[PDB]
Design a protein around this ligand. Structure first.
Ligand SMILES: Nc1ncnc2c1ncn2[C@@H]1O[C@H](COP(=O)(O)OP(=O)(O)O)[C@@H](O)[C@H]1O
Ligand SMILES: [Mg+2]
Lengths: 376, 376
């Protein structure tokens, strides 16, 4: 046993140096908490050192605040709750250990959002992730488990029909140009270059058992075995978020149904909602957003604050690990736990509209300056 | 006695609540049939409540309907025929109570099948199950009966020689080395984890009297006292399905002959063929299939349809085989009752050969429409 060897050393000699680190894990992990949890392990053998490695290796990130830790299996969140609970509370605006997560996958509860200004919104996307109970998560899953997961996913998705009928495209089976085309077109996950993906062990055996399934129009897609067992995605050009979300809920429900038929269930509990690798993706694990052109807003003052006020996050055109190019920003809901899928999409819709108005505060004749403070 | 107690309650007080159930048993068990059959029992004491317990415990799924009942002895099918007959008819595509099942274990009747293209067929296999008359089935057999069955099996199997010379491995005394080898060879079975099997009572006293026997060449395998008294499997790499089926037939014949010399025989009758625990396994209880490479066809939208038309079904795989090929499948006959063992193996042989033709067409980037078969 390796952990057994490490346990021969006093806890202080193994405690990581997080002095110049800026991630959620670093903000919570103390010498005391490390000494208390370093001897524990989940049934699959995942340990605290495994949980925090990415956060030790990556002091920060150039575009967003990172969590700095991952779960290796469903039991990770329980065995190491004294580490995860505070992180979750911080990352998800005060979500406490005693709080409950609520789901709402009914499109009808989303007001408007069916016509975000086309001149500003180039495309709308809604995604989430799901883990199959009984298997270890990507940071820890063996080649055998990953292949088993791929087998089940492929089997299940082959049942989707109608507008959701599609095909599975194994990473290994596509040419270099085919892969890059899908990536650049915003459909497929990038090559394993993410500092998180690398340091957490999620890039092992790449591209074995990884792939993408999608319908003919590429408006509904499922990533298999990338950062999570499954990443369910609904997307299309334009700003009809309502339509995107409706298709999302429909396909997501049909997928769970298919899995249940085979007696498989997604990792889920009343407190954390759906369980995923990264604590930031718990609850709904939902990220709804748009590629929005705001060449001046992205430059304007306190833009970072307007997004913070609306619980929104910004990413590059190529995603979280990229910068915005041509003034096109990736704007989506920053929160995922403590709000329902419907409430989340509603925040993006309402937030975008504002961003647009704030976007039109110069080309015509206006600008924030008068009615602003007076916080109430 | 206990049944006498229940008979003191009105039938509707003992009637199971199958409001949210989706299994064959639930479909046919009306309040009237329950009241008509709840007072009956077989000579071994098996009652209707015993027959349907697993179906009451396991609701099944709308999309995938389970059987929901089991036979506890040979008489169960007769005593509770008013339950089983409709279930059998529905499950086996219209097999009527008056239909006859023809058994054909003569390899000479199989046309060809000795040359399935080895560039596609990685291995061939034929599996079945048998029950020994005079003993209750797994859900109901006592420790004594189970041990008696094991002793008979071990004795007969130890008599096999030459190509069928083998060794017996009791689960009880199994070492770590033996189980790992058995695991690597895909020969091991463990205590069931399926609630459908557990709820029937078939896993009692595990692993008492359970065992694994296989010949030295590892082309003939027998499981003792698992789902049924005996599960017989013949296999080998390549596409010589005729050879596999021939070994299958010879092994079964010799075993049966050894049993007869001791005044024992397999449960069998002109209507249901070989009697087994689950109604879905009646008739031949045979599954003949191939591990086959079909990377192109496997991605074709008409793949599931072609298999359906050929009266075949598939299962994806999770090994290095499909990983390297990008599509290896387990394809076998779908029918069990109303077709002889020969007709069933013939359908796999004929179907496979067409699948290979379609695969070769797709390799040439051609269409397979002209090869599409009509439902048979
Ligand atoms: N609103 C959007 N419209 C079109 N593509 C998008 C949108 N948001 C993100 N993407 C695509 O998703 C990728 C980045 O995904 P991130 O890494 O941002 O996904 P994460 O949302 O997985 O769950 C990028 O390559 C980009 O092409
Ligand atoms: Mg991503």
């Amino acid at each position: 046993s390796h952990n057994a060897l490490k346990l021969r050393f006093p806890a202080e000699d193994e405690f990581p140096d997080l002095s110049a680190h800026n991630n959620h894990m670093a903000k919570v992990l103390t010498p005391e908490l490390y000494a208390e949890l370093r001897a524990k392990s989940t049934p699959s053998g995942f340990t605290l050192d495994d949980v925090i490695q990415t956060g030790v290796d990556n002091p920060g990130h150039p575009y967003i605040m990172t969590v700095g830790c991952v779960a290796g299996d469903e039991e990770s969140y329980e065995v190491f709750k004294d580490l995860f609970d505070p992180i979750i509370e911080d990352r998800h605006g005060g979500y406490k250990p005693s709080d409950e997560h609520k789901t709402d996958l009914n499109p009808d509860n989303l007001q408007g959002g069916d016509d975000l200004d086309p001149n500003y919104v180039l495309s709308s996307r809604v995604r989430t992730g799901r883990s199959i109970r009984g298997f270890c998560l990507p940071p820890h899953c063996s080649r055998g488990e990953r292949r088993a997961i791929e087998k089940l996913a492929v089997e299940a998705l082959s049942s989707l029909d109608g507008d959701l009928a599609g095909r599975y495209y194994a990473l290994k089976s596509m040419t270099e140009a085919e892969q890059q085309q899908l990536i650049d077109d915003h459909f497929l996950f990038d090559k394993p270059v993410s500092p998180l993906l690398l340091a957490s062990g999620m890039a092992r055996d790449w591209p074995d058992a990884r792939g993408i399934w999608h319908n003919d129009n590429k408006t509904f897609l499922v990533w298999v075995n990338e950062e999570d067992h499954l990443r369910v995605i609904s997307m299309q050009k334009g700003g009809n978020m309502k339509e995107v979300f409706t298709r999302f809920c429909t396909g997501l429900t049909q997928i769970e149904t298919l899995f249940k038929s085979k007696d498989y269930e997604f990792m889920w509990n009343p407190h954390l909602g759906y369980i995923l690798t990264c604590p930031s993706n718990l609850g709904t694990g939902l990220r709804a957003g748009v590629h929005i052109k705001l060449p001046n807003l992205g430059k304007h003052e306190k833009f970072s604050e307007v997004l913070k006020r609306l619980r929104l996050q910004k990413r590059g055109t190529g995603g979280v690990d990229t910068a915005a190019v041509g003034g096109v920003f990736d704007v989506s809901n920053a929160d995922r736990l403590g709000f329902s899928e419907v409430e989340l999409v509603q925040m993006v819709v309402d937030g975008v509209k504002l961003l647009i108005e704030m976007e039109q505060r110069l080309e015509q004749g206006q600008a924030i300056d008068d009615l602003m403070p007076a916080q109430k």
